[PDB]
Each structure stands twice: as C-alpha cells, then as structure tokens.
Design a protein around this ligand. Sequence first.
Ligand code: CLA
Ligand code: CLA
Ligand code: CLA
Ligand code: CLA
Ligand code: CLA
Ligand code: CLA
Ligand code: 8CT
Ligand code: 8CT
Ligand code: 8CT
Ligand code: OEX
Ligand code: CL
Ligand code: FE2
Lengths: 75, 137, 334, 451, 49, 342
Amino acid sequence: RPFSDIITSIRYWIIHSITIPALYVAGWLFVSTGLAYDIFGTPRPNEYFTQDRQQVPLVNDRFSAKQELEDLTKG
Amino acid sequence: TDLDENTRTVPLDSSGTTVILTPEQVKRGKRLFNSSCGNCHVGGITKTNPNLGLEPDALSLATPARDNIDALVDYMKNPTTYDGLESIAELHPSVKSADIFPKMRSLSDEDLFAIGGHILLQPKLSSEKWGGGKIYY
Amino acid sequence: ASAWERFCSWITSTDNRLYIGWFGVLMIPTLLTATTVYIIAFVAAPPVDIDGIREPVAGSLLYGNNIITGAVIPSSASIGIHFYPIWEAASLDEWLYNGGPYQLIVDHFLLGVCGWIGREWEFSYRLGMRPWISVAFTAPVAAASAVFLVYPIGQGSFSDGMPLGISGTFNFMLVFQAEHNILMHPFHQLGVAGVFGGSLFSAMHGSLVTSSLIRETTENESANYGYKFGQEEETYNIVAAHGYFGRLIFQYASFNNSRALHFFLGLWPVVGIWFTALGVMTMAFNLNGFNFNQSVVDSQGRVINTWADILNRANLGMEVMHERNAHNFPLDLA
Amino acid sequence: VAGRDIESTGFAWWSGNSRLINVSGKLLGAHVAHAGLMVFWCGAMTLFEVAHYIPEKPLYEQGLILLPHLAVLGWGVGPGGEIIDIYPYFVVGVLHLISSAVLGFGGVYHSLIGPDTLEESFPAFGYDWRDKNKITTILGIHLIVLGIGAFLLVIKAMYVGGIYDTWAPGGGDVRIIDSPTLNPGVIFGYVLKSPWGGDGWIVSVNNMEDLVGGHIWIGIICIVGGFWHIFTKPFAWARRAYVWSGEAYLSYSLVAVSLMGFIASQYSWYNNTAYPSEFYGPTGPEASQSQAFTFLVRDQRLGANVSSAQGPTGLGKYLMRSPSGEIILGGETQRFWDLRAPWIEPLRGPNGLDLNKIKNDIQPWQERRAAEYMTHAPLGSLNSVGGVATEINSVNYVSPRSWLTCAHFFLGFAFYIGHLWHAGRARAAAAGFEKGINRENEPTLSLRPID
Amino acid sequence: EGTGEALGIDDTRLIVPVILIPVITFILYAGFASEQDNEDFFDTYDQRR
Amino acid sequence: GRGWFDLIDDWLKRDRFVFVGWSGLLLFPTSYLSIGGWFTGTTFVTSWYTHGLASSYLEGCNFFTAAVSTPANSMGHSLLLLWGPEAQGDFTRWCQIGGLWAFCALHGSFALIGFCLRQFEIARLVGIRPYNAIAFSGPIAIFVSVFLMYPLGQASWFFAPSLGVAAIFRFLLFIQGFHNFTLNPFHMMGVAGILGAALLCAIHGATVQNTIFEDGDAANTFRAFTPTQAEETYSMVTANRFWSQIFGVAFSNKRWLHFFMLFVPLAGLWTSAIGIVGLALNLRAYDFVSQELRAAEDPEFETFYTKNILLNEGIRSWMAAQDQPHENFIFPEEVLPRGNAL
Ligand code: CLA
Ligand code: CLA
Ligand code: CLA
Ligand code: CLA
Ligand code: CLA
Ligand code: CLA
Ligand SMILES: CC1=CCCC(C)(C)[C@H]1/C=C/C(C)=C/C=C/C(C)=C/C=C/C=C(C)/C=C/C=C(C)/C=C/C1=C(C)CCCC1(C)C
Ligand SMILES: CC1=CCCC(C)(C)[C@H]1/C=C/C(C)=C/C=C/C(C)=C/C=C/C=C(C)/C=C/C=C(C)/C=C/C1=C(C)CCCC1(C)C
Ligand SMILES: CC1=CCCC(C)(C)[C@H]1/C=C/C(C)=C/C=C/C(C)=C/C=C/C=C(C)/C=C/C=C(C)/C=C\C1=C(C)CCCC1(C)C
Ligand code: OEX
Ligand SMILES: [Cl-]
Ligand SMILES: [Fe+2]
C-alpha cells in the first residue's frame, strides 16, 4: 500500500513508538559499553601509545601480521 | 595513555622542584593560552619574532632561564629581552601593561600559573611539535 | 523611415547569420580585441615579471613553450590591481614586461561574456521564447569573473588571477589549494557534485532517450535519420524510459514529467557552478575551507593524525615551494 | 482558496508570492511584515552581541559585526576606539526589537485581515503597476524618506554627539564634524574616480568631512528628486524605454541592490575610515603592511640598515620604490603600497615613508599596532581557524571584514541573478510569451531560413 | 595611474570625443524619437513604433 | 513455468516495488555488504595500525576525515580474506590490518557488475535498447582503473584511494605530486568529458525549458505536460534558430543530441581511465624533456610548467614522511625543499 497510507496509520506508530527507540538505545549501549573498541580493535583515547610504544604502530610483514598485532596490542 | 601525573608534573622553581598540575589547571591553561597569546604563540612559536620560540630549548637558554613555572610567571609580569637586560613590557603583553594590552587585564596569579603549566606541559606531549613550526604540523 | 530606425532594425535583425543585437554591439568588438591580443601574445610575447621581483616568466610559443606550457602570464605584482592600459606605460616594451596584455584580455573578455549573457537574453526575446538560458550561462561567467577578477580584487593583485594557459591553470589550482584548502571548502564540493551530477544526468538522460527511440529506420541506416527536423511527434517513448528507470531504482524516483526533468537538468549544474564560483569569490577574501588539522588528540593530548593532516602536508609542501623568491616574511598574508 | 491556489491563479505554492503581484493590500502586508523581520533581526542580534561581549578583547576579535556600526556612529566609545560603555548598544537593540512588534503586527494585519486590494477602499494608497504617475509619486515619497535618513546621519555627525574619526589628531576619537566638504568637485570627484588600484572610486574616503558633506549632498539630491517625481510623470523617452510592470520594477531594484551589495563588500574589505580597523579589525593590506613593518622594526633593532638591505632578488627586503617611485615597504607588501592607515601615515612624507622617521622615530605603539594587526589578519577558515589554510587548530578567529565582504559579495551576485531572472520574465510577460511558444503562431516558422 | 582624474581624463582633449560622440548619436536618435507617438499609454510596454 | 528453473525465473522477474531479477542474486548481497561495510569501517574501524591515522567517528573523526583506509603496505596485494594467512579468521586483527577496505572494494566491484547486469536485464525485459548499461561502463572503468589496477601496478593496496572524503582529497594531491597527473593528456580528455557533459546537461535543460510550447494558461508550466502525449513539448526549430544565430551551430536532430549527451561523459571517463592505467606503472606524462634541458642549461628560463614541477617536488618531500609511515622517511629540515621565508 502507498507509503503515506502506512505512515499516517496509527498501527504503524504503535509499533514504532517502541521498536525504533529500542535499537536507537541499543547502539548507545553498544558504544557506551566500550564493546565497539573490542570488536573492531579501535584504540580508545588512552590506547594510541604506551610504554616503549610512544611511536606509531605499524605492521611490517604480511604473514606474521597477527603475531605482531598481538605483540603491539598486548596492552 | 591517560593524562597521568608523570605528564602533569612540571618544574616549578629554578632549583629543581616540581609541581603536579591538576586537570582543571591544564584545561584553564590551554584555554587561557589559546585566548590570550595563541594569535602570536600558536604551536609554541613566535610569529612576530620567530628567532625566540617557546620550545624548552629556548626557554632553558634564556637569561634568566624560563624553563619553570616561577620564571615563566615572572616573565608574564616582568618581560625582558632574551638576555634579561632590557624591559620589553611596552612591547609584550604583561599584567603590568594591561591597559595597552587589554587581554592581560583579567589574568590572576592562578591564571598565570596555569598558562605556564600549559607551556611546560606541551613539549611533553609531542617530541617536536611544540615550537617545531610548519615542519611538524 | 529614419536612418536610426533602419540601423536599429539591422542590429536587431533576425536575418543576419549571426545575431548581433545591442549586446552584440558591445560583445563583438570586445571579444574580437581579446581574441586578437590573446593570439598575438600567446604566439609571441616577451617574458613577464609576474611576481614583481624582476624574474620574468616565459609564456609565449616563440620563447620556448608548447601549447601545454604556453600562457599569457598574469600582470606584475608591482602593478597590483592598478589599471594598466597601453597608454599608462612609458613604452610598449615595458607594458609587455609587466603583463599588461593579461589585463587587456581579461577586461575585454569579461565584458564580452557579460555581453554574451545579455545577447542570449536578447535573441531569446526576438524569437518570442522564454528567457533564462542566459541565467544558465551566468554560472560559467560567474566562475570566470571569480578567477580572473574577484580573486585579484580580494588578494589585491592581478598577478593572482589565473594565467591564460594550461600549465598556468594547474599552477593557479595548486597555489589556491595550498593557500585556501579549496577541496575542503564546501562550495567547491558542491561544484564537484554539480559537475559529477551533470555528467551522471547527461549520460543517464542520453542513454534513456537513445534507448527508447521509436523504430523509424531500416537496418542499413543510422537510427538518427528516424527523426526529421521540425516534426510534430515525439522521437522516443517517454513511457518506456520512465518505466525502465522506475524498475531500475524505484517508481517514485523517476521523473514522469519531462519539463520537470529538463528543469532539473538545467538546475543541478548551474547551481553547483554558482556555488563553486561563489566559493572562489569568498576565498578571494580569505574565508578558507575547513581546517581540521590536529582535531583528534589522545587522552594525554598528543595529536593523532587524520586524513586532514595528511592533506595538510601536501598543502604545506605546495605552500613552501610556491613563489620561492617572492616572500621575505614567514606569513603569507598577501 | 480563491487567489491562493494554482487553479485560480496559475502559480504553484513554490511561486506563491507571485500571487501577490496584483493584490496591493496583501502585498503591502508582505512588505511590512518582512520589514518587521529586518528590524527584529537587528534588535535581537545586537542584543546577542551585547550579551556575548566581554570587555577584555576588542570588537573585531570577538566576532562582533553590528556593535562596530554603533561605535562608528559615536556611541559608547572613547579615545583610541576603546568601547567604554555598551548601554547605548542595548538601547538601540531594545528599540529595534520593540519596533519589530509594531511592524510585524502591521504586516500580519495587512496580509491576513486587511483589505486585499487598496484600490477601492483607499484610493490614495491604491495603485496599478501600469499607472506611471502614481508609482512615480510613491518612488518620490520613498526618495524623500531616504534623504531624511541621510540628513539623520548628518545631524548625528554634526550636532548630536558626532561620529568616530579614526584620523583624528592624536588617537582616533569621537568628534564633531563641524566643516563637511560641500564642494561638488570633491563629492562628485569621488563618484567619477576610477575603481582600480590607488583610486578606489567611493571606497577611497580618507576623511569624515568628505563623508558627511557627501551625505548632505545625497540628502539634498534625494529630497529634490522625490519632489521632482511627486510632481512629474515619466518623459516620453523613458516611457518607451522601460517595462511598466511590478516584476520589472522588482528587477530594477534587484540590480541596484546587487550593485550596492558589491560596493558594500569592498567598503568593508578596503576602507578603514567608515570601517575603522580598531572595530572591524585590520584590512588585508593593513595586515600585510603591518607584517613588513614589524619585521622592519625588528631587524633595524638588531643592527640592520633597512633602507640598504638587499632581498633575495635584488629588491628591497624592507624598503623599496613603488612603480611611481614612492618609498614603500618591501616584500609581497609591494602590491599593498596604496594602504593609508592612521598608524602608518605618521611616518609618511611627501615622497613616501620618510627614512629619517622610519629609522629614528618609530614609536612603540606603532610596533604594538603592527604586531596586533599582523597576528589578526583576515585569513581564516569557515570553521573559524585563524591564520593560513595550513595552520593548526589553536586560534579561533575570522575577521569581521572577511565575513561582511564574503556575505555581501555573495548576496550581490545572487541579486544580480535575481535581476536577470526577473527582468527577463518582465520582458517576456509584457510581450506575452512567458508561458511558452504558441503552437499556432510560432515566430520561427514565419522567419526565412538562414543559410 | 592612481591619480584620481574624473573618468581618467588627464588631458582636456579626451573630453571632445566623450561629449561629442554621444551628441551625434543623440542627434541621430532624436530623428527616431520625434517620429514616434509620444502620448501616454496604459500598458506594460509601448507597441507603437 | 512448470519447471523449477522456470518457477525461479518467474519469481525473480516479478513486477513488484523492487525488481530483483537474476542479477539481484549478485547485486543485493554484495552491494549491501559494501555499503554497510563502509558504514562500519568509517564508524568503528581505525587506520592506526595501517596508516597511523584516526579514521572513525569513534576515534573522533567527522564525515570528512572518516574513511575506510587502505590496508597496510606490508600486505602487498593480498586478497585479505578473513580466513587468509594474514588475519587467519580473527575479525579484530582483520579490521586492524585494513582488510575491511579489501572487503568493501572487492564487494563493490561485484556490486557494480551486478548493477550493470541489472540494467541489461531490465532493458531486456522491458524491451528497450541497452544504452544505459553501456553508459555505466564508464563508472565501471573508473572504479576498476582507479581502485583495482592502480594499486595492483603499485607496491600494494596501500596506495589505492582510501574510501573517504579527506582520504580522496589526499589521493588527488598525492597523485598530482607523485605523477603530475594534470599534465597527463588522458586526464585532460577526461576533465574535458566531465565539464562538457555538465555543459550539455545545463544547456539542454535550459533550452528545453525555454522553448516549451504554450500548452496551458498557468504561469507555472510544469503541469502543462502529459506523459503519454504524442506531441513534442518544446520547439526544436526555435531552439535550433536560437543556437544557430547565437553560437553559429546548433543541434537539428534530437537523437544525435541525446547520443552526444551520452557519449561525452562516457568518453571522458574511458579516456581518464587510460591515463590512470598508465599511472599504475609510473608511465607518467611527468615532464617535457626539452624544457627540462633548457632550464638546466638556462637558469633564467622559467615557465608555469617548471613552477608546477617545483610544487610537485614540495608535495612529495613534505608528504612522504607522514603519508608513507612504513618507509620510515626521516627528512631533516636541511634536505626538505623550501623557499625563502615561508
Ligand atoms: C518574508 C516572508 C514572507 C512573507 C512576509 C509572506 C507573506 C505572505 N504570503 Mg507567503 N510565502 C513565503 C514567505 C513569505 N510570505 C515563503 C517562503 C513561501 C514558500 C513556501 C510562501 C508561500 C506562499 C504562498 C503559497 C502564498 C503566500 C501568500 C502570502 C500572503 C498571504 C498570507 C495568507 O493569507 O496566508 C494565511 C496564513 C495563515 C492563516 C497561517 C498563519 C500564519 C501566521 C499569521 C504567522 C505568525 C506570524 C507571527 C508569529 C505573528 C506575530 C503577531 C504580532 C502581533 C506580534 C502574505 C502577504 C498567499 C498569497 O499570495 O495570497 C494572495 C499565498 O497563496 N505565501
Ligand atoms: C508601509 C507602511 C504602511 C502603509 C503604506 C499603510 C497603509 C495603510 N494602513 Mg497601515 N499599518 C502599518 C503600516 C502601513 N500602513 C503598520 C506598521 C501598522 C501596525 C501599527 C498598520 C496598521 C494598520 C491598521 C490597523 C489599519 C491600517 C490601515 C491602513 C490604510 C489607512 C491609513 C490611514 O488612514 O492613515 C492615517 C494615518 C495615521 C493615523 C497616522 C498619523 C501619524 C501618527 C501621529 C504618527 C506620527 C509619526 C511621526 C511623524 C514620525 C517621526 C519620525 C522621526 C522618528 C524621524 C492604508 C492602506 C487601515 C485599513 O486598511 O483599514 C481597512 C487600518 O485599519 N494600517
Ligand atoms: C531610487 C532612485 C530613483 C529612481 C528609481 C528614479 C527613476 C527615474 N528617474 Mg530619476 N532621479 C532621482 C532618483 C531616482 N530616479 C533623483 C534623486 C534625481 C535628482 C533630482 C532624479 C532626477 C531625475 C530627472 C531629472 C529625471 C528622472 C527621470 C527618471 C526616470 C528615468 C531614469 C533613467 O532612465 O535614468 C537614466 C540614467 C542615466 C542616463 C545615467 C545617470 C547619470 C549619472 C550621473 C551616472 C554617473 C556614473 C555612475 C556613478 C557610475 C557607477 C554607478 C554604479 C552604482 C553602477 C525614472 C522614472 C526622468 C523622468 O522622466 O522624470 C520625470 C527625468 O528626466 N530622474
Ligand atoms: C540575511 C540578511 C542580511 C543581514 C542579516 C544583513 C546584515 C547587514 N547588512 Mg545587509 N544586505 C543583505 C542582506 C542582509 N544584510 C542583502 C540581500 C543585501 C543586498 C545585496 C544587503 C546589502 C547590504 C549593504 C549594501 C550593506 C549591508 C550592510 C549590512 C550590515 C548593516 C545593516 C544596516 O545598518 O543596514 C543599513 C540600515 C538601514 C538602511 C536602515 C535605516 C537606517 C537609518 C536611516 C539610520 C539612522 C542613523 C542615525 C545616526 C540615528 C540617530 C538619529 C538621531 C538621534 C541623530 C549588516 C551586517 C552594510 C555593511 O556593513 O556592509 C559591509 C552595508 O553597507 N547590507
Ligand atoms: C527583492 C527580492 C526579491 C523579491 C521581492 C522576489 C520576488 C519573487 N520571486 Mg524571487 N528572486 C530573488 C529575489 C527576490 N524575488 C533573487 C535574489 C533571486 C535569484 C536567486 C530570485 C529568483 C527567483 C526565481 C527563480 C523565481 C522567483 C520568483 C519570485 C516570485 C515568487 C517567489 C516565491 O513565492 O518564493 C517562495 C519561496 C520559496 C519557495 C523558498 C525557497 C528558498 C530557497 C530554496 C533557498 C535558497 C537556495 C539557494 C541557497 C539559492 C542560491 C542562489 C544562487 C543565485 C546563489 C516573487 C515575485 C518566482 C516567480 O514565479 O517569479 C515570477 C521564480 O520563478 N525569484
Ligand atoms: C552475492 C554474493 C557474494 C559474493 C559474490 C561474494 C564475494 C566475495 N566474498 Mg563474500 N559474503 C557474502 C556473499 C557474497 N560474497 C555474504 C552473504 C556474506 C555474509 C555472511 C559474505 C561474507 C564475506 C566475508 C566475511 C568475506 C567475504 C569475501 C568475499 C570475497 C572472497 C570470496 C571467496 O574466495 O570465498 C571462498 C569461495 C567461495 C565462497 C565460492 C564457493 C564455491 C562452491 C559453492 C564451493 C563448492 C565446495 C566444494 C565441492 C568443496 C570440495 C573440497 C575441495 C576439494 C574443493 C569475494 C569478493 C572476503 C573478502 O572480501 O575479503 C577481503 C571475506 O573475507 N565474504
Ligand atoms: C524589554 C526587554 C528587556 C530586556 C531584553 C528583552 C529582549 C527581554 C526585551 C524584551 C523585548 C520584547 C518582549 C520584544 C517584543 C517583540 C516582538 C513580540 C516582536 C514580534 C515581531 C513580529 C514579527 C517580526 C512578525 C512578522 C511575521 C511574518 C513576516 C509572518 C509571515 C507569514 C505571513 C505574514 C503569512 C504566511 C505565513 C508566513 C510566511 C509565516
Ligand atoms: C562489515 C562486515 C564485516 C564482516 C561480516 C558482515 C556481514 C557483518 C559485514 C557486513 C556488515 C553490514 C552489511 C552491516 C550493516 C550496516 C549498515 C547498513 C550501516 C549503515 C548505517 C547508516 C547510517 C549510519 C546512516 C546515517 C545517515 C545520516 C547521518 C544522514 C544524515 C541526515 C540526517 C540525519 C537528517 C537530514 C539530512 C541528512 C543528510 C539526510
Ligand atoms: C554618500 C557618500 C559617501 C562617501 C563619500 C562620497 C563622496 C562617495 C559620498 C557621495 C556619494 C554620491 C554623491 C554618490 C552618488 C552616486 C550616483 C549618482 C550614482 C549613479 C548611478 C546611476 C546608474 C547606475 C544609472 C543607470 C541607469 C540605467 C542603466 C538606465 C536604463 C537604460 C538606459 C539609460 C539605456 C539603455 C536601456 C536602459 C537599461 C533602460
Ligand atoms: O603572488 Mn600569487 O600569490 Ca596569493 O599568496 Mn601571497 O601573494 Mn604570492 O603568495 Mn601565496
Ligand atoms: Cl613577503
Ligand atoms: Fe530531451
């Protein structure tokens, strides 16, 4: 049925007064929990550098990349 | 790394005593530096006289040495040439010359302390950016 | 039945091969003068001291340039934006030393394109058709005035206008990026959207009109001959193209109305080029593109680079290397 | 719905105001409501500037654009362009904001409940776009009003407090302009001057006597012209040379106002008399010449003979000769040798910058001004990062001159585009082919083929 | 250049063309104008030439 | 219709809101996996371990500075499969070595393939000529030449265009500084095609909107068109007269006009693709040897070309240290090419 016919329907809004904010808040707790930094490996504001690692970290080998990544990301 | 106390400890006096700046102090110092002197001293340089920057090498080799909070704070009220023989209060922003430099009028002793803390804290953050100029932007 | 009336009828005549009109009265002499001086200066002209430091730059073919490197060099920085006609020079040789031909060509050409705008309106009026094709042409003229006139005015020197050459155009680009960061300036981004979208919509519209051409041609004959000039019927099925494009993306996106379609075609590139011309006009007065340099710092407060910083490195290289002998002081305020 | 839909008017909602062309009272309400919008913004914005104004920084460093106008008119500013009081700014703001209520009520009244057309209930105010005499009378009344405004500026400069002269003896100060220049050869000498470098046309006002005297001239001109148009009708040469419709009048106003926008943009960019550098900040030429002056003073202080110092290319590193021979500051400031500011004229002789004054008698305040104007050049980004494009994010600053110049150049170009649109449409609609080409009588098919 | 002469007229000779050529053009235009029906009209433009 | 293949074909080609088609089995997954991947990489994934940069909204970047940066240079031209010998199935390390760029690019290539196949399929089923699928070949050529063949000619995927805004600006200036790509005649032909296509779009829109026939009595003339009318809505003869007597030449044939509108941008894109393919192998129109020799022997010979060469040297030297961190370029201030003052 046509788009405007759905949007003005009350049932649409009984569904989406609850469904949309739920995931809008789910993203909030996804990042506020710090879970994104762990899934995607992104350094936090206090993880770009560390002791003996005041320089930029770079992977310099194709095949041992995981190995040096743990070595650099031991933290 | 966090803004630990190792970064926030800066020399206080000429003998060698240190002082640990608080996060409020460094925040206020950064804001005051950017508002009162950023126009000429953005990046630890001197736009009007690039021969004399704010990098720790220049401050240490100044007469008197300006690599400490008390010396910097005294410079902000009794500025002098690089050899400390002529007063340049009429050509430099100073709290004693705030009528002709209307940005120094509102600064208190704690504001001068925070500004000096910001100056001495900067070189700790980067190895060459503070006073390095374009080459390290 | 008066000589002035006959002259006005001839000028405003729709029987001349090329319409003159009253705007053409100003356009044709100005454009012809600009063309003549440009051709003469491009084939043969002495080097020009563009930067006002007695370091002439060659731009003419006879002085060791090709079509790619040739240019009519901008005026000397010593002149500034002072008016520099031939009669204000002690001699014609020193008129050519300080790049007077650039001033002549630019002034005559800007007046000529203004006359072209007006003449487009005029011959729209003589044929009884709607105006505003001229409004479409204002966008290129806006950009040309922005680069040739407004940028010298803001920066204060005709040396800063774009050179009338190909390599000089690239030089002006690189210096503009170094000094203003035009790429990060959102009006130039709107212009990039304008030209890319103009190409996209041109390709799309041509593809859909050519794709739904009504069969009016044999197999041993070009399809273009299926259309006869001045015919009354449409040469292609608007319904077929509209339905194909609706199935391609979704029905609502397609322009079922042809007049709205062509208004959008005329609107997107014209507005984009208006915006980028205005962006150059505003960076003439040093309202630069965005400066996100050192915008990300860690908890300690040390700068973590971004792509803005790496772009800044290229801008800084261009800044330091441009006009190596012209600057005596650290800031590039001029 | 009648007169407010496409069916009964032929105009869509997005050309909605085009449905006001022949509705005189509703159009009057539109104009009055929009004037209410203008005065509302003036009051609200200057109150915002007063609220955000800190007494430490100067006006130009705080992003303030409106309070400089009042300071130039001579309110709440002392010697040296130091803003001592900001209560008159508050008074102006509240007056504009309160007057906006009255103008908004009038506009909403005439738009919604007032008579649609004034031509039957108020024939004095009603009009037809094609009735040349009545439209000229309206134009003349407005010209008299503009002349009254010019004379209001004259009264302010001459009697009520006076205006801020940045060229005043000593430092710049608020002073009474007792002797404006009323010589036609000066006032209209400015109007016929060239716009190119060194001339500047009317942007090159270097004193307030010329400004006030030429405002007297503008007031006299406008009042005389208004009385001329009230008691006259357009002549035959004019009656055949114009399209006498509302859209044509709109296009004429649009082109005039676009020209004014360009001129005002360059006024804010180049002039430093009606736009003193102590309120609007340095001009670009001022900042560049200030950089050259600062480094001249520095190197002279360090033992260099600035007059005899040779730059990389053989030209003067600090001092050289302009193309006309005047001794001028060197480097890339050579293009800006036409700068004249109250802080640099003191060192200027008949033949340029006097070398004796430049060597022995540069005062400390000149060095301070040069440093301030160097560090506060008009350069900056859209997000307000002061300095060159390749600078770092520590200084938050764009000069008010850059904002005003860019905004008014933008609006001038936009209003030229609007003029082109509306003038073309006026011509097409008067001739009667603004809706399309008549399929019955197409002019092109009647024309003989070319080639 | 940069002297401030009105319309660039530094020599008085320059005025002779600047004033006369419009006057000859004005004289030629007057022959056209005098032939027109110069009474008023109530229209957006004059259709009478 | 009876057979299983016939049933699948019937369902895939159903006339619904979103046409699926057989090509949809290649387009919709990969395209989706591309776009969300970008939205993932530009939102959470970093370039700290590949470029030394922050490139996500999480790290603090905005829409301009956020990007899906290319892989590390040490990766070479690895396919960067999540199960490959580099990540070895670890999602976090995969994102950290910039394998998400490989994901986005390799899925985008097949998304472009699927969309061109979609254009062909819908053109066939609707029953029109397939000129729109051939015009998308231009964009396909741009993507293939710039994102696949260029890094495959260079040392690694690292030098591909990083998927962003500021990243693309950095790619533009990098290619200019290192290849002098503005001097490349194929780039010149491409920008000619692009600007000429924008010109054709603008002139055609204005001309059609301004030679419309009076098909109504409303000042707003959009409503005076019917989709199914068998009458041209604007005068080709009047437009031809206008442009012939204004510009000397003018289109007289609509079909030629609309093929030209197709040909100009497509030709531009293919020409510029030839130039970028040249740049993949460092076969660059960098210099005019005659002028280089003359300037070497004549220190007073200066052209705008030589100024551009100096600018390119500046770009290279001042950009290499931070743009190629894997090389560990330490250029002292002594060796950096500079000018007087600034
Ligand atoms: C400066 C802005 C401006 C102004 C002054 C006007 C004014 C006008 N427009 Mg509008 N218009 C504008 C912008 C503006 N327009 C824009 C941007 C668009 C594009 C969407 C339109 C589209 C448009 C259309 C399509 C039409 C008009 C029409 C009109 C006129 C009649 C209004 C009417 O009866 O509506 C009735 C409206 C209402 C009953 C809604 C309530 C509006 C209230 C009064 C606004 C509240 C204002 C303020 C808070 C009150 C302060 C009170 C004071 C005492 C303090 C009126 C003169 C009509 C016209 O031409 O008629 C002949 C018409 O058809 N306009
Ligand atoms: C562009 C401005 C404008 C114009 C042209 C008109 C025109 C009109 N209005 Mg008015 N009107 C306006 C603004 C305007 N209005 C505003 C701003 C408001 C809101 C306050 C109103 C509110 C309004 C109402 C409520 C009504 C009208 C009506 C009318 C009509 C009759 C006017 C009349 O009888 O005057 C008579 C004039 C006067 C009474 C004014 C006398 C002067 C006083 C004492 C002020 C003196 C000021 C002084 C000289 C200024 C010194 C300047 C110094 C600071 C330099 C007429 C069509 C009437 C109408 O259409 O009825 C259907 C009507 O009822 N108008
Ligand atoms: C808002 C202002 C305004 C407007 C809209 C009009 C409108 C009109 N006036 Mg004018 N007029 C005005 C103010 C105005 N007047 C004033 C203040 C005076 C002085 C008393 C006059 C004196 C006047 C007279 C004596 C006559 C008109 C007439 C006319 C009509 C013809 C205009 C024309 O063709 O000009 C043509 C303009 C020119 C040929 C050029 C103008 C010359 C100046 C000096 C140019 C100088 C160069 C300039 C500085 C260059 C740069 C400008 C830059 C902004 C682009 C028209 C109805 C005529 C009419 O029919 O009256 C009944 C007529 O004879 N007006
Ligand atoms: C978004 C809309 C917008 C905004 C917010 C502004 C804002 C501004 N414009 Mg404007 N402007 C706009 C659109 C806008 N403009 C457009 C579209 C154009 C056309 C292109 C212009 C063209 C324009 C010009 C030409 C100029 C401005 C200027 C200005 C500034 C001053 C306003 C002023 O006082 O005007 C003038 C105000 C009036 C005409 C109202 C009447 C004033 C009376 C008569 C003054 C009485 C004074 C007297 C001393 C009082 C005391 C009397 C007694 C006690 C003695 C201000 C920043 C000025 C500026 O600084 O430019 C750089 C300027 O010169 N604007
Ligand atoms: C003095 C100022 C002035 C006045 C009184 C009018 C009056 C009118 N214009 Mg407008 N116009 C102006 C300035 C003015 N114009 C300028 C400066 C331009 C050039 C940009 C135009 C361009 C224009 C067009 C193209 C058209 C009109 C039309 C009209 C009529 C209806 C407009 C309407 O209802 O809009 C209602 C308002 C809206 C729908 C809101 C739109 C807001 C836009 C989208 C925001 C701005 C976008 C973008 C930043 C602009 C870039 C411009 C570029 C040149 C830089 C009405 C007679 C229309 C008409 O029917 O004429 C008879 C018409 O077709 N005008
Ligand atoms: C339209 C569908 C489609 C397409 C064309 C692709 C294409 C691609 N994906 Mg995949 N992908 C898809 C859907 C799709 N994907 C979906 C829905 C998901 C989400 C679950 C993913 C998730 C995903 C990830 C996480 C990754 C890819 C990657 C890839 C690339 C590597 C493919 C590869 O080598 O896989 C392996 C080969 C195949 C899958 C083909 C199978 C062929 C037959 C059916 C096997 C038969 C078995 C045989 C009999 C076994 C006998 C044993 C032995 C002797 C042979 C390639 C661009 C990689 C990439 O982009 O790296 C940068 C990558 O890491 N994709
Ligand atoms: C007294 C004081 C002391 C300290 C500071 C403080 C600010 C608080 C100050 C108080 C000031 C006060 C209360 C000021 C009051 C001002 C008021 C109420 C101003 C209102 C002005 C009204 C205006 C513009 C109306 C204009 C309306 C227009 C065009 C409407 C447009 C429209 C119309 C007409 C028809 C179609 C719809 C559309 C387009 C919306
Ligand atoms: C990535 C990856 C790795 C391995 C396997 C796996 C299948 C998971 C694979 C694929 C993952 C996929 C496809 C994930 C899906 C993620 C997607 C689709 C993310 C997209 C998110 C969209 C976003 C933010 C949109 C934001 C939009 C904005 C602001 C719009 C701005 C606007 C607003 C807010 C108001 C008006 C103006 C304007 C400009 C329109
Ligand atoms: C007020 C002030 C402040 C600072 C000091 C200063 C001395 C400058 C002082 C004085 C300023 C003065 C006196 C300014 C006066 C400005 C003047 C008189 C400007 C003149 C503007 C005139 C213009 C555009 C005329 C253009 C008219 C045109 C096309 C008319 C129409 C037409 C004609 C003529 C022929 C072709 C067809 C068409 C288009 C119908
Ligand atoms: O000349 Mn052309 O250019 Ca615009 O900046 Mn300053 O001066 Mn030079 O420098 Mn960078
Ligand atoms: Cl310099
Ligand atoms: Fe078409």
